[model samples]
Target: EKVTLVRIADLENHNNDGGFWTVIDGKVYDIKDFQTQSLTENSILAQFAGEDPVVALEAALQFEDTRESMHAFCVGQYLEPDQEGVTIPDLG
Candidate 1:
């Protein structure tokens, strides 16, 4: 008989931070945006117990985007921007 040892990765999987994009109900969202993240290259067949998973995923993604957008969003309420990107001038 021979002895063999397997690595942790071989026994389990890796945890990648980014996933792919998917579309459903006329919307697009990155899976990673949701909480369904995995590190290794494995198969995940999700069967939603409710509405479409893609729909749910998009909502979360959009929520994140909206928050980020709002952070970057300015009415140009100020004459100068202290962060990155352009701060347009108030036309009024």
Candidate 2:
């Protein structure tokens, strides 16, 4: 399998245009579609766009099913500038 390496800048650029991307545990997830399916008029996911949601998500860890649902949106491995050209293992 191949992994797409996404930079922090790339993540930030996607925060607008109804395209939201967030990082969690070094993984990038494109949550635009997920937001469309949300029940609330204002989604917490929007607040977290272009940022790491690990801390916020930690608070919701009790809801394992809800947390697990995010996995489906996984798009790539977050790439750090210092780690460029290095092979990253998929911890999932």
Candidate 3:
């Protein structure tokens, strides 16, 4: 276990109106924003398995198309700090 990320999307605490999520093991997990809401989270343990933590994390992201939504297979990421997406270079 190198870089275990915990993602949570909060749509109640503020007006963001969104939830948190993270991509792990090729699966997208939606983090429920618990603000007077009943949201449950599961503890997951992962291993680098003889590889670098960064490399493992990258692999996880590439394993699938993260654009999926919670309603339509959405795995929350932007909602979570640790699972934030990379800023792409401007091509303007």
Best candidate (score: lDDT): 2
Clashes of each: 4, 0, 7
Reference-based TM-score, model 1: 0.22
Which residue ranges in model 3 land beyond 4 Å of their true spot?
Answer: 1-47, 65-91
Listed per candidate, the RMSD to the true structure in angstroms reads 18.1, 6.9, 12.6
Global lDDT of model 3? 0.36
Highest TM-score: give the candidate number. 2
Per-residue CA lDDT of model 2 for 1-92, tens digit only, reads 89888898888877765568777778887656655534344564544444435444543333565567566667789978878757779984
* TM-score for all models, in order of appearance: 0.22, 0.54, 0.22
Q: Looking at model 2, report the run of 10 residues with the lowest lDDT sum.
A: 53-62
lDDT of each: 0.34, 0.64, 0.36
Candidate 2: Cα lDDT at 63: 58
Q: Rank the candidates by lDDT, best first.
A: 2, 3, 1
What TM-score does candidate 3 reach? 0.22
Model 2 pairs whose backbones collide: none
lDDT of 3 by residue, 1-92 (tens): 24433344332332354544444443444433221122222311133334443344444345553222223433322335543575656885
Q: Regarding TM-score, does 1 or 2 come out ahead?
A: 2
**lDDT for 34 (candidate 2):** 58
- Pairs that collide, model 1: 14-39, 14-40, 15-39, 16-39
